[PDB]
């Protein structure tokens, strides 16, 4: 019964809100019928909140956005691993993770909320991890440049090798940042929409080195007024 | 029904009495549909509007779901006891009789009506009146 009011809200509120397909301006875009849209942060967060009701009953949704000139870290693993056995990502591992993305990206441009989900498994190469970490705005050469040096990092590797993986590199594509991502929930073709494990958060200090919250708005990029997150 | 598809188009298709006291049906024949050679942008004699039937049961349906997504609109708004009865009804009466527009029986009533709302009275002795105009096969 609940979904209606997207249909409604895109034929009534949205239409005027008319994006060119190619055009780089979009920023929330649909392949179901390959409708590209550049929205202002009101009806942003509006659709938001309805894909969140959305998913608190079910269906399934093909939504995708692309990152512009400022936006959060969203990657994309391709982990291909040996046996389809789950190696469940242990509160250690996820840590592990987070402190090599972190050291990655000091030397770098500096002044932190952590959103971990994964496949449901059952599927021949294994599961896949896309960490989203949209609390700053680096969006430009740099992102290219952490994309490299992850590329040649070796503990993520090792930390892969931990759980059993059979594909210590090559699982991150070289174009990461480079390509449009998909919300949380936006299911693939044939394919189980992803679930979260696990969302913990930090703060980074310049000096010294769940379900209470509009999870679509605040892993959102582009949004920058977020409750839980902040546009650091 | 038959009101409203002479609103939507009640200049494409006339109706008047023949001779034999029956009544014909005229359709204004337009580029991009299927003809026959040479009447291109002229009336054509219509024994049975086949057209007519064909976008009373295609097109009605979109003012059709689109009162019935304003209906559903006007419910959600929350009010008085109008919406948990009164719109309550309106909408499984109109979703019961929604479904009328499929059938065969009622399409020929409708068109039946319509006959009357077509009507333009002096147009078949008026057709190929004037000396001037000579159709062709570009027009």
Redesign the interface.
């Given at each position: 019964a609940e979904v209606?009011?997207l249909e409604?809200l895109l034929?009534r509120e949205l239409s005027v809100f008319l994006t060119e397909p190619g055009s780089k301006k979009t920023n929330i875009i649909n392949r179901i019928t390959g409708k590209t849209y550049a929205l202002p942060s009101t009806e942003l967060l509006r659709l938001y909140e309805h894909l969140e009701q959305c998913r608190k009953q079910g269906a399934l949704m093909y939504f995708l956005e692309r990152q512009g000139t400022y936006s959060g870290l969203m990657l994309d693993y391709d982990l291909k691993l040996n046996t389809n056995a789950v190696p469940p990502l242990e509160p250690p591992a996820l840590s592990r993770l987070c402190h090599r993305i972190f050291v990655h990206i000091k030397n770098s441009s500096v002044l932190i909320h952590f959103f971990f989900t994964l496949k449901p498994e059952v599927v021949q190469g294994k599961y896949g991890f896309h960490v989203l970490i949209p609390g700053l705005k680096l969006a430009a050469s740099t992102k290219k440049s952490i994309i490299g040096s992850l590329q040649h990092d070796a503990t993520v590797q090792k930390i892969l090798h931990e759980q059993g993986v059979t594909n210590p590199e090559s699982c991150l594509d070289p174009h990461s940042a480079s390509v449009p991502s998909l919300l949380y929930g936006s299911s693939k073709l044939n394919h189980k929409p992803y679930q979260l494990k696990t969302g913990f958060e930090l703060v980074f200090d310049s000096s010294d080195p769940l379900e209470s919250y509009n999870l679509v708005s605040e892993l959102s990029l582009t949004n920058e007024q977020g409750s839980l997150v902040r546009p650091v | 029904i038959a009101k409203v598809i002479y609103a939507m188009m009640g200049n494409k298709f006339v109706v008047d009495v023949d001779s034999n006291g029956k009544y014909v049906w005229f359709e204004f024949v337009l580029p991009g549909q299927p003809m026959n050679q040479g009447e291109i942008w002229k009336w054509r004699k219509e024994v049975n509007p086949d057209e007519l039937h064909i976008y009373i049961s295609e097109n009605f349906s979109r003012v059709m779901d689109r009162i019935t997504e304003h209906i559903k609109y006007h419910l959600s708004q929350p009010h008085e006891s109008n919406i948990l009865n009164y719109y309550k009804k309106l909408l499984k009466a109109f979703e019961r009789s929604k479904s009328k527009i499929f059938n065969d029986s009622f399409k020929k009533g409708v068109i039946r009506q319509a006959e009357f709302l077509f009507r333009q009275r002096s147009f078949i002795q008026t057709l190929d009146t004037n000396p001037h105009l000579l159709g062709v096969g570009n027009g």
């Open positions: 209606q009011a409604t034929t | -």
